[PDB]
Amino acid sequence: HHWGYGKHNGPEHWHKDFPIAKGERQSPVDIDTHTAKYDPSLKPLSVSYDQATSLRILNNGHAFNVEFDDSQDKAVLKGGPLDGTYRLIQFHFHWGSLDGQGSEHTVDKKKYAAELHLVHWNTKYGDFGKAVQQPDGLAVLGIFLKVGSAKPGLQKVVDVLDSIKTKGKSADFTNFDPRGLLPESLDYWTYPGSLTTPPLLECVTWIVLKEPISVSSEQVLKFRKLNFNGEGEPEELMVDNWRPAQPLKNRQIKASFK
């Protein structure tokens, strides 16, 4: 009876195994565009993905993760609110059963169909496992997905999903270029928060882009054909793998843009 996104093991239950669920810097949050503060001290984000090396795609039972070689500084995030260099380890999405929900962060209470998380860890901590123990360990770049025109740079991902339908399945996934998932603008909001799944550790500088990417209805429909279950177990569609907005508490969201 481990955590998940059902009635009996979903977000309202997580605090029993993971008490930090009710902590002081949990994610996601609603982004109130009118009360976010423009911060002129914030730097442009530096997204350096030209040498990114993707390796594998994995159904981990709650998402599909596209994994990168993080054994060197090949795909790094810097600048913005960060001090130091953060290496890309993996990206994944959170999505809904319907186009009107699926994002974790919301914008003036608006839910997008999905949210992309590009996960990076602070190289001064040496590895991801160590980084998650630290208040500045991770930098997650969050990008909203709306349904409309297809995102061509997403289709290679969509096309391999039928090979990792069930929990624990993996497939080789080389030469995928994550630059193909980024919007035009790197205008962002930023705040200190947490992993949005167990263990809910409070180790994340969130960087949420203002501009959504468009994906097609067919693209997101293919996300919804994945399974939470293992092969040979009863079929539970992998949908609604998002945590709702948490209390902002003693935090202010900062904007990079006016």
140 binds ligand A1IRU (CB under 6 A): yes
Site string for ligand A1IRU, 113-132 (x = CB under 6 A): ----x-x-------------
Closest among 138, 131, 92, 95 to 243, alpha carbons compared? 95
Stretch that binds Zn ion, among 75-83, 111-119, 122-130, 248-256 (CB under 5 A): 111-119
Residues near 194 by Cβ (< 8 Å), separated by ≥ 6?
A: 20, 23, 25, 26, 27, 200, 201, 202, 203, 204
Regarding 117 and contact with Zn ion (CB under 5 A), the answer is: yes
- Active site residues per annotation: 62
Residue 186 touching ligand A1IRU (CB under 6 A): no
DSSP 3-state of 159: helix
Shortest reach from residue 94's CB to Zn ion, in Å: 6
The answer to the question of whether 33 is labelled as a binding residue is: no
Give CA–CA dist 90/212, Å, rounded. Answer: 20
* Cα 212 to Cα 18, 35, 47, 144, 251, distances in angstroms: 31, 20, 17, 5, 24
CA 181, 151, 206, 227 torsion: positive or negative?
A: negative
Angle at 243 between CA 21 and CA 122, to 5 degrees: 70
105 binds Zn ion (CB under 5 A): no
* Minimum CB distance to ligand A1IRU smaller for 82 or for 195: 195
Is 106 marked within a binding site? no
Among 85, 196, 227, 256, binds ligand A1IRU (CB under 6 A): 196
Q: How far is the CB of 112 from Zn ion (least distance, A)?
A: 14
Task: Determine if 77 is a binding residue for ligand A1IRU (CB under 6 A).
Answer: no
Inter-residue contact 244 to 196 (CB < 8 Å)? no
- The residue type found at 76 is V
- Is residue 167 a contact point for Zn ion (CB under 5 A)? no
Interaction of residue 256 with ligand A1IRU, rule CB under 6 A: no
Q: Which residues bind ligand A1IRU (CB under 6 A)?
A: 117, 119, 140, 195-197
Q: From the annotation, which residues make up the binding site? A: 92, 94, 117, 196-197
